[PDB]
């Protein structure tokens, strides 16, 4: 991504939006928390049905 963004740099490019990708880490914590919510909701749905 560093490579291609430099190759096609400047402000008027996808770079200026995909900043949030290229600069930032992917957080596993939120992923796991969402999965836990999903499990809770699944159990709730099962019980309700």
């Amino acid at each position: 991504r560093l490579i291609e963004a430099s190759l096609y740099g400047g402000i008027s490019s996808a770079i200026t939006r995909s900043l949030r990708d290229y600069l930032l880490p992917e957080n596993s914590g939120v992923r796991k928390a969402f999965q836990d919510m999903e499990a809770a909701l699944r159990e709730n749905r099962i019980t309700l049905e």
Binding site: S6, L7, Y8
Partner: protein, 49 residues
Amino acid sequence: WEEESRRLRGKDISPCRLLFLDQAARLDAKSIATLFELCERLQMQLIIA
């Protein structure tokens, strides 16, 4: 990336720095001059075409 890694590398190791640009003609004389200024200040290499 370097701030992070230099801690995790040989203390006398300085990773190379090299970037790219296609259609470098979007640059003009002053553009070239200032980019070279900052590039040298950052001891970095250009492949601008």
